[PDB]
Write a protein that binds this ligand. Structure first.
Ligand code: NAG
Lengths: 128, 50, 48
């Protein structure tokens, strides 16, 4: 079973890139689909974007295309995500979620889609 | 060795190269270039009485 | 030197009666000291 730990909460002047990390345990990144979700205060949590097990690898939301780029380090087992051009509405808590890539024996395996295990959130704050 | 080389009906296994008779004398051989079994038989001989 | 044989055994005792001679499969020029051995198994991840 995976356990997810988070990075530190941050506050930054708008006009710069942020760096949000997700460190996993037990199961390596190559066995897991990774996704990221924004939760604003007073609003529902919304999906930033994540991995695709088939027809592509990593794809982003339509309101966040060209803004969020997403790297994976198998050597240190960390999923980084970065985004520039901060906005005052982006004062929110960011979540990394993960799931198994497939399910079953190697002889008979089926593809898997979803967000199973939720890590702790990192509060990103854009102010003066 | 001296002899005649003939076609053999002895089914050699893939690892087996040489062949022996009951006497443990060289009875068959597998050529390294082309992989068929050549039965070795000594040339014609006999005793002569006058 | 490794010798091997594969024999189809009708359901019963795993070590059967009779003779099945092992053909010499492979010889390896290793030239090391060996006193202990271990068997390698394949293991499958759960994903459930
Ligand atoms: C040469 O010998 C090898 C066996 O070492 C054999 O496989 C190969 O067919 C031979 N070459 C020819 C042209 O017959």
């Amino acid at each position: 079973e995976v356990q997810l730990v988070e990075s530190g909460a941050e506050v930054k002047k708008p006009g710069a890139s942020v760096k949000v990390s997700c460190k996993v345990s037990g199961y390596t990144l190559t066995e897991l689909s990774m996704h990221w979700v924004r939760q604003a205060p007073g609003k529902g949590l919304e999906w930033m974007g994540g991995f695709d097990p088939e027809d592509g690898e990593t794809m982003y939301a339509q309101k966040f295309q060209g803004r969020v780029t997403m790297t994976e380090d198998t050597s240190t087992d960390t999923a980084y995500m970065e985004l520039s051009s901060l906005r005052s509405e982006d004062t929110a808590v960011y979540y990394c979620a993960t799931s198994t890539a497939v399910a079953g024996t190697p002889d008979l395996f089926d593809y898997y889609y979803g967000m199973d295990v939720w890590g702790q959130g990192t509060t990103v704050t854009v102010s003066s | 060795g001296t002899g005649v080389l003939t076609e053999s009906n002895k089914k050699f296994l893939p690892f087996q190269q040489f062949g022996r008779d009951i006497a443990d004398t060289t009875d068959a051989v597998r050529d390294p270039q082309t992989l068929e079994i050549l039965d070795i038989t000594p040339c014609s001989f006999g005793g002569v009485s006058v | 030197k490794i010798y091997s044989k594969h024999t189809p055994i009708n359901l019963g005792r795993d070590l059967p009666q009779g003779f099945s001679a092992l053909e010499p499969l492979v010889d390896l020029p290793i030239g090391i000291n060996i006193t202990r051995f271990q068997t390698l198994l394949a293991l499958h991840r759960s994903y459930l």
